Amino acid sequence: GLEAKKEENLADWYSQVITKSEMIEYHDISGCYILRPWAYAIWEAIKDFFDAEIKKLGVENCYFPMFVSQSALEKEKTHVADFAPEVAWVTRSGKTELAEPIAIRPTSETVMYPAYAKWVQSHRDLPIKLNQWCNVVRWEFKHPQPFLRTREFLWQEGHSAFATMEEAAEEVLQILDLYAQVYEELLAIPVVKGRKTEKEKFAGGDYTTTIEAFISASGRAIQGGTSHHLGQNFSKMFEIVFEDPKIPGEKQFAYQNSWGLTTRTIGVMTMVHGDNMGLVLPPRVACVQVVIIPCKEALIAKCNDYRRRLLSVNIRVRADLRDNYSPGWKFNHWELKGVPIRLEVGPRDMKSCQFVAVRRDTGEKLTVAENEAETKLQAILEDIQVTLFTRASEDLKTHMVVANTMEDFQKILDSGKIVQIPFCGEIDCEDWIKKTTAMGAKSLCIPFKPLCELQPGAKCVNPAKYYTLFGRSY
Amino acid sequence: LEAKKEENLADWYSQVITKSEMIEYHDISGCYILRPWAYAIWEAIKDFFDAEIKKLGVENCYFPMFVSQSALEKEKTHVADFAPEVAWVTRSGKTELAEPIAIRPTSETVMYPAYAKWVQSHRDLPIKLNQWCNVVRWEFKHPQPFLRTREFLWQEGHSAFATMEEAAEEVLQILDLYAQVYEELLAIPVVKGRKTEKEKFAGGDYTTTIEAFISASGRAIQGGTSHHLGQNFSKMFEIVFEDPKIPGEKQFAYQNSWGLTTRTIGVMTMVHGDNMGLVLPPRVACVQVVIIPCGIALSEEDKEALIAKCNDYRRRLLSVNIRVRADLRDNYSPGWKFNHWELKGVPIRLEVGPRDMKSCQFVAVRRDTGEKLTVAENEAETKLQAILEDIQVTLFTRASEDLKTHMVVANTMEDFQKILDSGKIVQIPFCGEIDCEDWIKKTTARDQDMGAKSLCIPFKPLCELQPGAKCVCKNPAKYYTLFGRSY
Numbered sequence: 001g002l003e004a005k006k007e008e009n010l011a012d013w014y015s016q017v018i019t020k021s022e023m024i025e026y027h028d029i030s031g032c033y034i035l036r037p038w039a040y041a042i043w044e045a046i047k048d049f050f051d052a053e054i055k056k057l058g059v060e061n062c063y064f065p066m067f068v069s070q071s072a073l074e075k076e077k078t079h080v081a082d083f084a085p086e087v088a089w090v091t092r093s094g095k096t097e098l099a100e101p102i103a104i105r106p107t108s109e110t111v112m113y114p115a116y117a118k119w120v121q122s123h124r125d126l127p128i129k130l131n132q133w134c135n136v137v138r139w140e141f142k143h144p145q146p147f148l149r150t151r152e153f154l155w156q157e158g159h160s161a162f163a164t165m166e167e168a169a170e171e172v173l174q175i176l177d178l179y180a181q182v183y184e185e186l187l188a189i190p191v192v193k194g195r196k197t198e199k200e201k202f203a204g205g206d207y208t209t210t211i212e213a214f215i216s217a218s219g220r221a222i223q224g225g226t227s228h229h230l231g232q233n234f235s236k237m238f239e240i241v242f243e244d245p246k247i248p249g250e251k252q253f254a255y256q257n258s259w260g261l262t263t264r265t266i267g268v269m270t271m272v273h274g275d276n277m278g279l280v281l282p283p284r285v286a287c288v289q290v291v292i293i294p295c296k297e298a299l300i301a302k303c304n305d306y307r308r309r310l311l312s313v314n315i316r317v318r319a320d321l322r323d324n325y326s327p328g329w330k331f332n333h334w335e336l337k338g339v340p341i342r343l344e345v346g347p348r349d350m351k352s353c354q355f356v357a358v359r360r361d362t363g364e365k366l367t368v369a370e371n372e373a374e375t376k377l378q379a380i381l382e383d384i385q386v387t388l389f390t391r392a393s394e395d396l397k398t399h400m401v402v403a404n405t406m407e408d409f410q411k412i413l414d415s416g417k418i419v420q421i422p423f424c425g426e427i428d429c430e431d432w433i434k435k436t437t438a439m440g441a442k443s444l445c446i447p448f449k450p451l452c453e454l455q456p457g458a459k460c461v462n463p464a465k466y467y468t469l470f471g472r473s474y
Numbered sequence: 475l476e477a478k479k480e481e482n483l484a485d486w487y488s489q490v491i492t493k494s495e496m497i498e499y500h501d502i503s504g505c506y507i508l509r510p511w512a513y514a515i516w517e518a519i520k521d522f523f524d525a526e527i528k529k530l531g532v533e534n535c536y537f538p539m540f541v542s543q544s545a546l547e548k549e550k551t552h553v554a555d556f557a558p559e560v561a562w563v564t565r566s567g568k569t570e571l572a573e574p575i576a577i578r579p580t581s582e583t584v585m586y587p588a589y590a591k592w593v594q595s596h597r598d599l600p601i602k603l604n605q606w607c608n609v610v611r612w613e614f615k616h617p618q619p620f621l622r623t624r625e626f627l628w629q630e631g632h633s634a635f636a637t638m639e640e641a642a643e644e645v646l647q648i649l650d651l652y653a654q655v656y657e658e659l660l661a662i663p664v665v666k667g668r669k670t671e672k673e674k675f676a677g678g679d680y681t682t683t684i685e686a687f688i689s690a691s692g693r694a695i696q697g698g699t700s701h702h703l704g705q706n707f708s709k710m711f712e713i714v715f716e717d718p719k720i721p722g723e724k725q726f727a728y729q730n731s732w733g734l735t736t737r738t739i740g741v742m743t744m745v746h747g748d749n750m751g752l753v754l755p756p757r758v759a760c761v762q763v764v765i766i767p768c769g770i771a772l773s774e775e776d777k778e779a780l781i782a783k784c785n786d787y788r789r790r791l792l793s794v795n796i797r798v799r800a801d802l803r804d805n806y807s808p809g810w811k812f813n814h815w816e817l818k819g820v821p822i823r824l825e826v827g828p829r830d831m832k833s834c835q836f837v838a839v840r841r842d843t844g845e846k847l848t849v850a851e852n853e854a855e856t857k858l859q860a861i862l863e864d865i866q867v868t869l870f871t872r873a874s875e876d877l878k879t880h881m882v883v884a885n886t887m888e889d890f891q892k893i894l895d896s897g898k899i900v901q902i903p904f905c906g907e908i909d910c911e912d913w914i915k916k917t918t919a920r921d922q923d924m925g926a927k928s929l930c931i932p933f934k935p936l937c938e939l940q941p942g943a944k945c946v947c948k949n950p951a952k953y954y955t956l957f958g959r960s961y
């Protein structure tokens with residue numbers, strides 16, 4: 001039983017939700033968390049979707065080394081100068097000092113791009129589109145939290161190289177849309193697509209696109225996935241060049257993108273859809289969509305007749321026929337785990353050709369005829385998915401509003417909301433917003449489709465260049 | 475490709491793995507990039523093994539890569555001989571860590587502390603977890619792409635059971651699955667066996683293994699490992715439960731652990747590769763058939779028609795589940811493509827030219843034999859699928875007969891030494907003592923014209939040991955033991 005309340009102390013509600021759902025176990029190294037099968041299976045569903053989609057775009061899977069040499073990492077600013085403290089360094093094997101220390105990838109640009117330079121000697125050799133599923137380490141400064149901000153995490157990073165800007169620019173938005181599908185269609189989480197401001201964008205790229213999600217219970221936004229156009233910053237840095245097709249002896253630098261998505265997805269799913277009864281799984285990612293619990297031989301045969309029939313309609317179902325646990329225990333158990341539907345069968349319903357289905361999201365008990373099983377259970381699963389998305393949508397609309405001068409901006413921000421405001425775009429101004437609201441508010445993204453069109457000649461909260469989504473964030 | 479596999483094995487191997495576009499070199503010694511052509515093979519192995527272990531009830535998870543200094547040293551999980559292979563993170567940025575942290579060389583000390591917390595009663599067993607992950611071992615021995623790399627990808631399975639008989643049954647099920655990966659996927663024959671006392675995982679009860687043979691070097695290699703740990707680790711980490719029906723007794727879990735790595739791909743390369751390059755077994759080839767337009771005089775519409783035919787073969791082949799690629803690139807000649815996909819080891823090259831179209835035929839060329847066949851266009855799905863099956867059987871049959879030729883029996887040290895020096899591995903009567911196995915290693919080095927180590931005690935040796943047979947020292951022999959020079 002979960003005894004914390006998401007409204008009371010978010011930090012202790014989250015800790016008990018991830019542990020009692022058997023998603024997370026704690027490790028003795030700060031910011032490192034064990035992914036138990038319940039959590040890992042969600043990542044695997046995400047991985048199945050994204051991998052298939054990027055494969056349609058021509059991207060191929062690979063695996064590059066985890067260790068990055070001091071020269072390659074230092075080669076040029078993959079990072080900016082402040083990222084250096086988050087890099088973990090190996091300096092010895094056993095008791096023997098390494099001649100030069102080696103770093104654990106915090107990202108793989110500096111591992112991959114020297115090889116890209118070797119593979120590209122003509123425009124024939126482009127595009128290169130590689131993706132890897134792997135683990136990366138960042139010795140994070142902020143307070144660690146499972147799946148939101150971890151010291152080690154799992155991700156996919158995609159790195160693609162092109163002959164022209166226009167090819168690259170198209171992929172950036174293709175990948176971002178796929179990140180948006182993961183959140184919206186898989187995890188039933190609504191997101192805002194946008195571009196990072198000068199201050200918040202990756203210093204190694206030209207522009208950074210992003211999807212931002214909102215976590216009501218904290219009043220904070222969070223970056224869900226990232227898709228950069230690196231332009232020619234890295235190809236100039238690593239000499240990824242090909243020969244001009246028309247002009248003797250003349251070199252062109254490749255255009256590059258890089259994009260990544262992490263297990264942070266699962267934490268956002270938890271923070272958005274979790275309730276005071278525990279985890280709530282969107283059916284699309286639930287490895288168990290229906291759990292069957294009997295409330296011997298006659299009644300179980302009915303339970304297994306339901307479970308074979310549900311498998312026959314491609315529904316992921318588990319029959320919890322264990323005799324060593326009381327039904328009440330099972331109810332609590334699978335509710336904490338967030339199974340979308342509990343299918344209860346008692347002696348009463350069996351004789352009636354009946355059963356009761358309990359949806360995890362709303363709690364309604366539904367009495368359905370036995371014949372009705374595959375058709376009605378799948379209809380409930382799709383309404384749970386739609387219901388979870390609709391509830392989080394209307395929650396996002398409620399907490400994302402518009403203000404046009406600083407005093408109005410703060411009042412909404414202090415009410416636990418994020419707001420789109422007319423913005424200079426300049427770093428000095430964004431710093432000032434950061435400390436005036438302080439607890440300080442950051443820019444989240446410049447939305448592709450802002451709530452309002454910017455008023456003719458409107459000024460920042462210099463003239464305004466764009467409505468920018470601001471808020472307190474992770 | 476310049477080098478020849480029989481002349482200089484190391485440079486042939488370096489040339490096959492790079493010109494097949496499997497491997498790229500890194501500036502960290504013993505670390506190698508897995509380009510998509512190699513990684514697709516890993517994915518094929520992964521897809522098979524993963525499905526199989528799920529049938530056995532094993533679940534997938536992911537445990538931290540970092541091992542605290544205290545946890546790694548807290549218990550005797552490994553012999554101190556392994557300490558030099560552990561890589562240590564000692565600082566972030568320029569700030570030294572208060573305590574250094576180790577990179578997982580294996581995950582016992584990370585997992586088993588959590589197993590102890592999760593095991594509170596008999597209800598909590600069995601625990602069967604598997605993780606696909608990367609591991610670091612600062613190898614002293616000569617690193618080689620995929621055979622011995624300082625970072626590698628693997629699967630490690632760790633299971634805990636209430637009873638010994640459950641544990642023991644799984645050890646051999648996993649061993650059998652490893653044997654199916656090598657034999658049915660990679661077409662490599664293997665010898666199942668048990669490791670000698672010297673060669674076993676010191677922390678377990680017994681170690682089973684599959685051993686593979688690489689003829690061109692006359693050297694064997696450990697292809698996969700499956701341990702019964704008994705209760706050695708459950709006692710160290712207190713993975714215990716009280717059976718209420720057995721009041722006053724602590725029930726220590728019976729455990730297994732098992733692992734398989736990207737060494738698989740290197741053995742496949744070494745076993746089936748030839749002087750034209752890689753040879754992929756159809757079962758793991760990410761491209762089973764490459765379609766190449768030939769003979770491209772032709773109007774633009776005619777050329778478009780010939781590409782249309784190539785794409786129609788590609789949809790026909792996809793429709794019966796053959797993995798196919800149409801190399802429709804206009805910037806390379808057909809002859810270039812022939813060589814390119816041969817170096818990559820594609821099982822079947824399907825050539826289509828304009829005369830072939832008008833004739834309603836195509837040409838299929840098998841990578842394993844080089845045989846060219848003219849096939850009727852209507853017969854494409856059935857004939858290509860039949861050839862793919864015969865390639866697979868051909869590759870396994872060749873490597874089988876090669877293993878049979880190079881694995882023989884000797885009952886005297888002098889015969890053992892002579893047979894060994896001919897590039898073979900040998901089953902000999904062996905006492906089993908560690909001192910003796912050391913003796914054999916340095917005598918087979920001294921008296922050679924690299925010492926030989928024990929490979930496994932075969933489950934099914936070639937000959938039965940005679941009553942009162944004595945070892946090749948003077949102690950009696952306990953069992954026929956497979957010996958050889960090894961990677």
Ligand SMILES: Nc1ncnc2c1ncn2[C@@H]1O[C@H](COP(=O)(O)OP(=O)(O)OP(=O)(O)O)[C@@H](O)[C@H]1O
Pocket residue numbers: 138140147148149150151153223224225226260261262263264474
């Ligand atoms: N410590 C972390 N734990 C989990 N996910 C993370 C962590 N740091 C970054 N991410 C995620 O990685 C994705 C791509 O990595 P990237 O380098 O763009 O992150 P970032 O800009 O440093 O993120 P943030 O400001 O949210 O820490 C982001 O969309 C973010 O969701």
Ligand SMILES: Nc1ncnc2c1ncn2[C@@H]1O[C@H](COP(=O)(O)OP(=O)(O)OP(=O)(O)O)[C@@H](O)[C@H]1O
Pocket residue numbers: 611613620621622623624626628696697698699732733734735736737961
């Ligand atoms: N450096 C390595 N690179 C690739 N695979 C490896 C490496 N070391 C071990 N393996 C493989 O990992 C499997 C399981 O790991 P394990 O620790 O049992 O190996 P091991 O006994 O140390 O190996 P070896 O005798 O080759 O040194 C072995 O069966 C072997 O095939």
Ligand SMILES: Cc1c(Cl)ccc2c1ncn2CC(=O)C[C@H]1NCCC[C@@H]1O
Pocket residue numbers: 078079080083084086087106107108109138156157158202226227228258259260261
């Ligand atoms: C600590 C640190 C360093 Cl040292 C260097 C770059 C870093 C970083 N933290 C964040 N980035 C930026 C990136 O990772 C760019 C993109 N890499 C590919 C996947 C998507 C990702 O956004």
Ligand SMILES: Cc1c(Cl)ccc2c1ncn2CC(=O)C[C@H]1NCCC[C@@H]1O
Pocket residue numbers: 551552556557559560579580581582611629630631675699700701731732733734
């Ligand atoms: C360097 C080093 C250390 Cl420091 C510690 C244990 C080691 C090791 N080298 C080898 N083993 C032995 C193992 O890994 C045992 C089993 N672990 C589960 C998967 C299969 C594997 O056989």
Ligand SMILES: [Mg+2]
Pocket residue numbers: none
């Ligand atoms: Mg960061």
Ligand SMILES: [Mg+2]
Pocket residue numbers: 200
């Ligand atoms: Mg950022």
Ligand SMILES: [Mg+2]
Pocket residue numbers: none
């Ligand atoms: Mg070893």
Ligand SMILES: [Mg+2]
Pocket residue numbers: 673696
């Ligand atoms: Mg060994």
Ligand SMILES: [Zn+2]
Pocket residue numbers: 423424429460461462
């Ligand atoms: Zn301003």
Ligand SMILES: [Zn+2]
Pocket residue numbers: 904905906907910911945946947949
């Ligand atoms: Zn002996």
